[PDB]
Structure 1
Amino acid sequence: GRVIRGQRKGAGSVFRAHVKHRKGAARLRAVDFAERHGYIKGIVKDIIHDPGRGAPLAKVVFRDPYRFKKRTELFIAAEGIHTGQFVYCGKKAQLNIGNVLPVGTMPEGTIVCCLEEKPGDRGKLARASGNYATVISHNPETKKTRVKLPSGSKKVISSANRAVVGVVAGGGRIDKPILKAGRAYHKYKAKRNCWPRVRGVAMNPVEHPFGGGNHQHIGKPSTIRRDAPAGRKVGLIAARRTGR
């Protein structure tokens, strides 16, 4: 009868993302002469960290090669980047940690992060806190390249798009146990209102389809059609297997 939590995360307005103190988008410096033909320069200012993200950001100062000014960016810092390092960008850049190149240039097996899935979108893939994406193999004509993502899936990408070299800094954030309910509330209090999650079996059948009963049992198979209406589509969504 009611509208189940999960249906409500869409309207927002409470279930909305918590973003006052966030330092700004973690982007990748869109393209020009410098990226498409040369090797524009720039130095690292600081490694300030943003709330709600395990990776530290880096304010990298280039200088705009068209008007006397100083463009400043926010790169997801590759592990090893320090303050004062020179980060070089573009096609003619050389292969070492923190230099953004086009994946077409660097050899196979290179370990990159903050990759783009379409050319120019300023960095989308493999940028979480400790993830990387290994370049697999090239294809000179058709200008495509095969890339392995942290999920283990392999994706064919156009050789143009760029990606910084190295791994994302802050690896192993999942290794230390949260260890107390305080540290969880205190952790999501920087991301959005998705915390203490009530299991459906504890709600009355008007609020969640797994409800009701004189015992706290589910009642119907917890695997559910992918072609489900919103509101039923709860539990194991379109599970192919189910079990360890």
Structure 2
Amino acid sequence: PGRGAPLAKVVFRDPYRFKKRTELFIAAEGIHTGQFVYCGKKAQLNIGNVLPVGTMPEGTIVCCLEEKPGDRGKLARASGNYATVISHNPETKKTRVKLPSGSKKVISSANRAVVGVVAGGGRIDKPILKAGRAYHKYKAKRNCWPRVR
């Protein structure tokens, strides 16, 4: 509730103790239940995999990009949005990417991201058509909607 992007509940194995770790990835469009996703440096280029930007080619596009090397995803999280890996330089370990706003950002090559575009498509294409539909939209978000000039 409150976001247009579907969430993906993904279960991993704990590498250090006998337990199952459940994550709440942002669903890249095209992923389905029962699909294996792979996260790490040696993961392959497939929709839903998480791997550092520095290991990705010069034109790939990504879904849940890290602003800093080590936090979780921060960029291109809203539905339908994506970032593009423009360029690299192996020295200084930097990668230039294009954000959904069109701005250009230099980030560390160790920042991870999900391959693909986030699901939720062109949600803004449909006209809302109704003050009631807008009311139900913002009731799940916050108290901001009926806006007095």
Consecutive unaligned residues of structure 2, counting only runs of 5 or more, are none
Identity of aligned residues (%): 100
CA displacement 1:64-104 (0-9 Å, x = unmatched): 00000000000000000000000000000001100000000
In 1, the alpha carbon distance for the partners of 2:120 and 2:64 equals 14
In 2, the alpha carbon distance for the partners of 1:175 and 1:66 equals 46
Give the root-mean-square deviation of aligned CA atoms: 1.7
Structure 2 counterparts to residues 37-52 of structure 1, below 5 A: 51-52=1-2
CA displacement 1:98-123 (0-9 Å, x = unmatched): 00000000101101011001011110
In 2, the alpha carbon distance for the partners of 1:173 and 1:152 equals 20
Relative CO higher for 1 or 2, CA cutoff 8 Å, sep ≥ 6? 2
Greater fraction helix: 2
How many angstroms does 1:171 deviate by? 1.1
Q: Normalised by the size of structure 1, how large is the TM-score?
A: 0.60
In 2, the alpha carbon distance for the partners of 1:108 and 1:83 equals 30
Consecutive unaligned residues of structure 1, counting only runs of 5 or more, are 1-50, 199-243
Runs of 4+ aligned structure 1 residues displaced above 4 Å come to none
How many angstroms does 1:195 deviate by? 1.2
CA displacement 1:177-206 (0-9 Å, x = unmatched): 0001000001100000001000xxxxxxxx
How many angstroms does 1:173 deviate by? 0.3
Secondary structure, counterpart of 1:168 in structure 2: coil
Alignment-derived partner of residue 31 in structure 2: 81
Secondary structure, counterpart of 1:118 in structure 2: coil
Alignment-derived partner of residue 103 in structure 2: 153
Asked whether 1:126 is paired with 2:43, we answer no
Count of equivalent residues: 149
Alignment-derived partner of residue 140 in structure 2: 190
In 2, the alpha carbon distance for the partners of 1:128 and 1:108 equals 23
In 1, the alpha carbon distance for the partners of 2:58 and 2:34 equals 29
The structure whose Rg is larger is 1
Q: Normalised by the size of structure 2, how large is the TM-score?
A: 0.98
Secondary structure, counterpart of 2:120 in structure 1: coil
